[PDB]
Amino acid sequence: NNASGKLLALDSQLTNDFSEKSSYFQSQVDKIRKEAYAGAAAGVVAGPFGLIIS
């Protein structure tokens, strides 16, 4: 009966933390988008060539 409860207890936590890591992932992807387009933002020290190659 002890491990019978331990099973369900771990299961609910698993199901919660799956979606919580999913939320972490979606918060992470757009962060990486912002960081990428921000690293590509300051490439204007060159002319129009440095823009499009960035």
Partner 1 sequence: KTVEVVKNAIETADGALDLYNKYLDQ
How many positions of this chain bind partner 1 (CB under 8 A)?
7
Q: Give yes or no for residue 35 binding partner 1 (CB under 8 A).
A: yes
Stretch that binds partner 1, among 3-11, 13-21, 24-32, 39-47 (CB under 8 A): 39-47
Residue with tokens 């204007």: 44
Residue 11 CA to its chain's centroid (Å): 24
Q: Does 3 bind partner 1 (CB under 8 A)?
A: no
Largest CA distance in the chain: 72
**Which tokens is 19 given?**
């979606």
Q: Is 29 in the site for partner 1 (CB under 8 A)?
A: no
